[PDB]
Write a protein that binds this ligand. Structure first.
Ligand SMILES: [Mg+2]
Ligand SMILES: [Mg+2]
Length: 206
């Protein structure tokens, strides 16, 4: 089974690189960029988790999607902290160099960490090293990025510029606060992909 997301096929079941834990596709969506106000569709993405995520979030079943995604609903934090394995697959639609992409991640993660009073010396150096990992790469159209939260406290990053699914992980975020902030970037109250978050909330509320 596959779902078509922006003309990209997303498998409905997925084991991240080097993992044998099979995750279910929970929701899908896109992110954007802009050049001088012109809006450009930037990536397609899918959010995956162990199917027991539904039981962890039982209290949200039956509620309206609007009530789940709304500010101060409490849903976002519960989704982010659920202790099952999770992953995000990103497929690049408009190509970008690695340094601008990594610097944008750095900006958005710094915002969230400073909001929590968690931007101490350790976190600042973890973001610098993440930028440095991305800097030598190019991310052409079709490139795949995988972020895999085996635990909520780390992220395994796998990357294939050629657009295959990688077999090895390329980088590991070991800082727990950066790991949670990267999940908040996609599923938080200030998500950069309201489409993906709305899609996940529909599946949980179903
Ligand atoms: Mg370089
Ligand atoms: Mg780190």
């Amino acid at each position: 089974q596959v779902v078509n997301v922006e003309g990209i096929d997303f498998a409905t079941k997925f084991a991240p690189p080097t993992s044998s834990t099979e995750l279910d596709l929970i929701g899908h969506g896109n992110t954007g960029m802009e050049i001088e106000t012109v809006e450009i569709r930037f990536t397609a993405m899918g959010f995956y988790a162990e199917p027991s995520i539904s039981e962890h979030l039982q209290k949200w079943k039956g509620k309206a999607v609007s009530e789940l995604v709304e500010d101060d609903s409490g849903f976002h934090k519960e989704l982010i902290q659920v202790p099952v394995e999770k992953a995000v697959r990103i497929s690049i639609i408009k190509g970008i160099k690695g340094l601008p992409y990594g610097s944008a991640l750095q900006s958005s993660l710094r915002d969230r960490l400073v909001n929590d009073d968690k931007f101490e010396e350790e976190e600042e150096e973890a973001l610098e090293k993440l930028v440095e990992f991305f800097q030598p790469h190019n991310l052409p159209k079709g490139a795949n990025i995988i972020y895999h939260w085996a635990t909520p406290d780390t992220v395994k990053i796998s990357l294939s510029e050629e657009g295959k699914i990688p077999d090895e992980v390329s980088y590991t975020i070991e800082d727990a606060n950066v790991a949670e902030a990267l999940l908040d970037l996609y599923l938080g109250e200030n998500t950069i992909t309201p489409s993906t978050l709305s899609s996940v909330a529909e599946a949980i509320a179903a």
